[PDB]
Symmetry: D2
Subunit: 133 residues, 4 copies
């Protein structure tokens, strides 16, 4: 019940999201939710050729701005974004069921009780064999 | 649709398969189908603590042997394996729907029409941004 | 030839940079230079437990005191000098450095020879590569 | 002396080794030393276009063949191999100082007091952040 997101896979998902976001010229900018959306944001910015990357922290119109986070679950962040950026295009990479109807787009379905680990919280490390033989 | 198998992901599936082949001592060795089964074979051998790794090329009876290939589709390979090693336990990492019942064990379901690419056939290389913006 | 930086390696270098910047609490925040500094910035923020990540874009207040400013690579020092003018008191770091730019950064991790071309993992992907022999 | 070798990096080395074993048709087969040489051997097989991959196990004439292991250190393994296959071309990916001239080819020089960790003994796992802040 643990979902491992490797860097390569994250990048594959982000490129899929970026192609759906084409043409790039419809967008003025990218706003990354600190800090889960920072990496997915950098990835969109690279693929869409958008240099205007901003961050917003959560403890303005927004039309033509992509607002990105890594995951939607409850949708609390999605709600909070709408306060200052009600016309923004809110997207995430991953979505759990309750958050699915609260985003403008997402790439991968994740079940509610699955724990997803993001690659910035992981590393390549020695792992003992499954069998002591 | 193009399915990309990264090394990290391949290894994750191999470990999932290995814990299903637990306990290890029930096995005497492993036979890898050249060349698709070579790497998954190596990984199984590591995770099970088995040094006896053999190979077979497809143009002894197999008792207590694991026979591994990367992907089952038609089951042509499975047939030959069953003829050479009727007493052997045949597994793959990936299975397309036709092959699904022709293996004793597998890990990942692949659609019939999806093209899967294995990491030994790929490499990390510059890829032009999706947008020229 | 080309120096390939994979995601795994970049992260190893960022963690090394993070350990040197310890203890975290001596820092108010992180300013990532868009776009090269964004991922290295995000990695630093995770490792130092800093939630306050800003960005700066250079084209073509504060003095930055207590802030880390991060970019991917220093070479000429064009970005560096703009960063000095804009943030005279920030600690300016990169992951990679070519010899021309070394004296202009407060800290970096990997020395890259001047004429080496380095490819960052956000510009790369896992793709089919034809075998070396046709046989 | 904490040297992490990832899958991508291993594959880069194996491709470099394959290139210097060119032209391919001068070889008739590859013999992988189990278990260290299996993945490298599999990679050589793909790159040189050799379907004929065998294995050999050593515990405690080979003409026109490549025998491959992951690393030479003492050369003890090389000795057994020269005895078994006096005309084989013996190659490794990595070589520590005592072993370097004891193989016909290698790619990476490794210091004696460096411990390298191969990617089949590792995995992507959660790593606590450097600061608890
Ligand atoms: N790494 C990881 N994080 C998770 C997981 N599930 C929930 N989250 C996060 C969701 N979250 C948010 O602020 C987003 P939202 O709930 O839509 O406002 C805080 C975290 O709990 C999970 O399986 N793995
Ligand atoms: N790389 C890759 N290979 C594939 C794919 N689908 C089928 N194969 C192979 C399956 N195969 C076999 O000999 C095994 P079997 O069909 O069970 O006897 C030959 C190939 O066509 C695919 O999506 N990608
Ligand atoms: N990916 C990669 N980028 C490079 C390389 N060498 C130079 N750069 C960049 C450095 N750069 C900057 O604005 C930073 P600075 O030169 O200190 O002002 C522009 C690019 O030319 C290289 O080998 N690889
Ligand atoms: N993964 C890894 N393995 C190592 C290392 N150094 C030595 N080895 C192995 C080399 N070895 C051999 O039998 C080869 P040889 O000594 O030439 O006959 C057994 C292990 O000690 C190391 O840094 N990393």
């Amino acid at each position: 019940e643990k979902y491992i997101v490797t860097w390569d896979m994250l990048q594959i998902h982000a490129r899929k999201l970026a192609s759906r976001l084409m043409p790039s010229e419809q967008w003025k900018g990218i706003i990354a939710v600190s800090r889960g959306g920072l990496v997915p944001g950098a990835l969109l910015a690279r693929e869409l050729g958008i240099r205007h990357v901003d961050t917003v922290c959560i403890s303005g119109d927004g039309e033509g701005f992509i607002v990105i986070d890594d995951l939607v679950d409850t949708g609390g962040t999605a709600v909070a974004i709408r306060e200052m950026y009600p016309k923004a295009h809110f997207v995430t990479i991953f979505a759990k069921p309750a958050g699915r109807p609260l985003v403008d787009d997402y790439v991968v379905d994740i079940p509610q009780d699955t724990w997803i680990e993001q690659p910035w919280d992981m590393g390549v490390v020695f792992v003992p064999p499954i069998s002591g033989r």
